[PDB]
RNA sequence: ACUAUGGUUUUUAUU
RNA sequence: CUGCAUGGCUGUCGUCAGCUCGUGUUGUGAAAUGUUGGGUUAAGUCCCGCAACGAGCGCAACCCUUAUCCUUUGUUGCCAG
RNA sequence: AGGCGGCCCCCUGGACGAAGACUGACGCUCAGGUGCGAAAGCGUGGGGAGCAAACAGGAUUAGAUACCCUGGUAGUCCACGCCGUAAACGAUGUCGACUUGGAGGUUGUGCCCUUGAGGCGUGGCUUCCGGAGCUAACGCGUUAAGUCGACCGCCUGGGGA
RNA sequence: GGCGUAAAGCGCACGCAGGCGGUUUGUUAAGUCAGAUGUGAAAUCCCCGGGCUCAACCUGGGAACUGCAUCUGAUACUGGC
């Protein structure tokens, strides 16, 4: 029904004076644990207003994930500029498979058994653009009439 | 920002006064001596008798005051048309005869030295204070008012860090001449570290 | 399906090559119109129209053109249905969440003139912020009493909107046009052929379409 | 109708 | 002793017209849009135009003050009739 | 390709269309090879009005080696050799192929009383516009930096190179 | 994995050796694939089990070395004719 997850934060680089801005950047992630993510980034003044911006914006958005066995419908390539994305299914009964900061994605989507490549840019706040360009690329036929699968 | 001060700088327009006090004008400047022997036994007994604001009333060589208090039955008991158990009291400490007067109060909790003194009892004792800030700007805002600033600054840690913070709701007019902003100070030391609070609440302009 | 004018015909080339969608001849230098391959297109452009009108859907009729801005007022004295004869706006419904800012300042300005603060000293300068009602009357005024967003966009000519046009595409809104061999569509998603002449475009259709708003009921 | 300079080190976010 | 700690008060531009907000829009993003553009002013002042729109603080108001003609008073002040 | 115009000339390679026809894969790309020069330079011989690296004269200036301003060599013109080179810069490799339209230029080939004191089809080339797409962005847009292929050459951090 | 630019397209064209080349019906079976024989020890990483207290050491078969040669075939596609 709902899961809800913390990815990451960062302080603005600008030297403003004399001293530095005080702006934070936040990214957080929500789901369902069943077949459904959305993602969210905001930048506010210190941690406790960027954090909620970004809270905010992936209370916003909603994307299906294909499912088939428990694993993907099919691999996928999504791609955000140096994020080059491409993911996979993986073997019956496994969840390591997932590590890393794509754990964090799968464990709000519920599918662990997922393998992904970057290609390029992990960096969190472009990697999760590139992840969910690869969803709308997810395919759902809609073509059982004529073609196999399914 | 942040200097201009609500009941400093902008309290000489259309705001009730807190202290009047009579004297003949070539020894005005030998009776300013006397401003502080007024108040000196005084100051802590008005939480005491739950004073939300006092008026220093004082003719030529008198004293009389007038207190606005939500809950006089602390101080007087039942049922209020007799003062002679706190005038005894103002008049042993000031050396002259006394005449006192108390009034009521309307919206107690409208009030930014109540928000002030709800903050500070976090503040002093090292305890989670968000949750009596969250709660005071609810209280406010739905008991009256159109903007709150309720400010914190100084051992916010986290253990050692100090830090400031805020978190404003509605909107708070600080410049502007007429506003009529009710505002409060408070400052303190643990003697482990020193804290700040600041208060100020908008309600309607002139 | 009634009349519908659909040819006279008259004048030379000024049609679209590609991108051909009714034109299959020229004779006299006149070029022809197929009516067969359109006959499951007036069977849908009013069959649908009547559809989401037996559903109250909100239908937006657009004439800023000066031959069809009073005939479309008299069509709003004959239907209860929204009309715009004026200006748009960018964000005229891709920005409403903010845009009814303006539908609510509308209907603050049109009681503000009774106000005991009017009367006050010079008629003249007593007037100057009321007078900016002229301009949300011009842009929002068709709207202000809609409560949302229209299930439709009905046109009568295929290229002489354009913001009209922005604002309802985008936005998953289908807009209905009519189109002449002088003419090519785009931003449209129920398409027909017509004429570009006022007695046919506007004396015509502009009547047969409000023939089938008022059968609603649902 | 007219000209060349500046070593090295280099401080606010809180009692 | 010291304004490279920590408050408070602080120079001058200058009453200067500027600094900002929420939701949309736009870019890979810092950033941009609006507040830019066109006439006007003391002026982000007001019209024009408009994928951006309406708003907040500053402004303008508000407040003080002056020549003239009135008005209250009528004194040890003033003297037309 | 670099490159090439005072004017007037001869010798000689090359492209392509419509109605069609014949030959019969004869078509593309290349390691090392093959071949030549813009402006200066060198050699070996001429020539000199103007301009002018270098050089001489006075200012300007702290100085002026530059500008100002008076003179001026090589060189600029001409030919046979040597130099063999750069932005040889339109920063783009040679070839084969698939895309959506407007108007003109140029060069072929058809049609319509040309009926207007004019137009429409359609190959080789081309100037401006111009719908998708490509890109870090500016750019490239069917003569693409789009979209797919054949072959060759090049490249692995600053500077040292 | 790149070569308009940040690092790389020869100054340019021609071309010997090399690389590459429309289409159909025959024909060949080199290349490709199929049915088998022979071999790649001991091992590799892996699946299941054994002689000794566990383990080495020794196993006892799987999975496997995708190649190389011979035998018997297939002929779409590529090459030869």
Same mark, same amino acid.
């Given at each position: 029904e709902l899961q809800e997850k913390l990815i990451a934060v960062n302080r603005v680089?600008?030297?403003?004076?004399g001293g530095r801005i005080f702006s934070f950047t936040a990214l957080t992630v929500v789901g369902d644990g069943n077949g459904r993510v959305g993602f969210g980034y905001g930048k506010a003044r210190e941690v406790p207003a960027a954090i909620q911006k970004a809270m905010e914006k992936a209370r916003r958005n909603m994307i299906n994930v294909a499912l088939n066995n428990g694993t993907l419908q099919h691999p996928v390539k999504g791609v955000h500029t140096g994020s080059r994305v491409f993911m996979q299914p993986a073997s019956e009964?496994?969840?390591?498979?997932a590590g890393g900061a794509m754990r964090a994605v799968l464990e709000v989507a519920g599918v662990h058994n997922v393998l992904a490549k970057a290609?390029?840019?992990?960096?969190p706040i472009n990697v999760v653009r590139a992840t969910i360009d690869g969803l709308e690329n997810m395919n759902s036929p809609e073509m059982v009439a004529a073609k196999r699968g399914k | 920002g942040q200097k201009v001060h609500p009941n400093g700088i902008r309290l000489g327009i259309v705001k009730p006064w807190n202290s009047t006090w009579f004297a003949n004008t070539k020894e005005f400047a030998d009776n300013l001596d006397s401003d502080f022997k007024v108040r000196q036994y005084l100051t802590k007994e008005l939480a005491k008798a739950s004073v939300s604001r006092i008026v220093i009333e004082r003719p030529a060589k008198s004293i009389r005051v007038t207190i606005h208090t939500a809950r006089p039955g602390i101080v007087? %008991?039942?049922?209020?048309?007799?003062?002679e158990k706190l005038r005894k009291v103002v008049a042993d400490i000031a050396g002259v005869p006394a005449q006192i007067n108390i009034a009521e109060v309307r919206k107690?909790?409208?009030?930014a030295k109540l928000v002030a003194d709800s903050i500070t009892s976090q503040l002093e004792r090292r305890v989670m204070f968000r949750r009596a800030m969250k709660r005071a700007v609810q209280n406010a805002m739905r008991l009256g008012a159109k903007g709150i600033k309720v400010e914190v600054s100084g051992?916010?840690? %986290?253990?050692e860090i100090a830090r400031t913070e805020w978190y404003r709701e509605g909107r708070v007019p600080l410049?502007?001449?007429?506003?009529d902003i009710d505002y409060n100070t408070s400052e303190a030391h643990t003697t482990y570290g020193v804290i700040g609070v600041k208060v100020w609440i908008f309600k309607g302009e002139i | 399906m009634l009349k519908a004018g659909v040819h006279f015909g008259h004048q030379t080339r000024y049609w679209?090559?590609?991108?051909?969608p009714f034109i299959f001849g020229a004779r006299n230098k006149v070029h022809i119109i197929n009516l067969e391959k359109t006959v499951p297109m007036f069977n849908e452009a009013l069959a649908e129209l009547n559809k989401i009108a037996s559903r109250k859907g909100k239908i937006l009729f657009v004439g800023t053109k000066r031959a069809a801005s009073e005939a479309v007022k008299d069509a709003a004295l004959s239907c209860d249905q929204f009309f715009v004869n004026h200006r748009w706006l960018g964000?005229?419904?891709?920005?409403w969440k903010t845009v009814r800012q303006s539908i609510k300042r509308l209907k603050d300005l049109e009681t503000?003139?009774?106000?005991?603060?009017?009367?006050?000293?010079?008629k003249k300068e007593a007037l100057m912020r009321t007078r900016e009602l002229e301009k949300l009357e011009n842009s929002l005024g068709g709207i202000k009493d809609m409560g949302g967003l229209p299930d439709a966009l009905f046109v009568?000519?295929?290229?002489?909107?354009?913001i009209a046009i922005k604002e309802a595409n985008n936005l998953g809104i289908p807009v209905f046009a009519i189109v002449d061999t002088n003419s090519d569509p785009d931003g449209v998603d129920f398409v027909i052929p017509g004429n570009d002449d006022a007695i046919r475009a506007v004396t015509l259709y502009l009547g047969a379409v409000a023939a089938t708003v008022r059968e609603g009921r649902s």
């Open positions: 680089s600008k030297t403003v004076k009964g496994t969840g390591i498979i290609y390029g840019s992990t960096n | 007087i %008991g039942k049922k209020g048309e007799d003062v107690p909790e409208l009030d051992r916010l840690g %986290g253990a410049h502007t001449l007429r506003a | 679209n090559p590609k991108m051909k964000g005229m419904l891709t920005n503000q003139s009774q106000d005991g603060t009017f009367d006050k000293l010079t009568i000519d295929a290229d002489h909107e354009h």
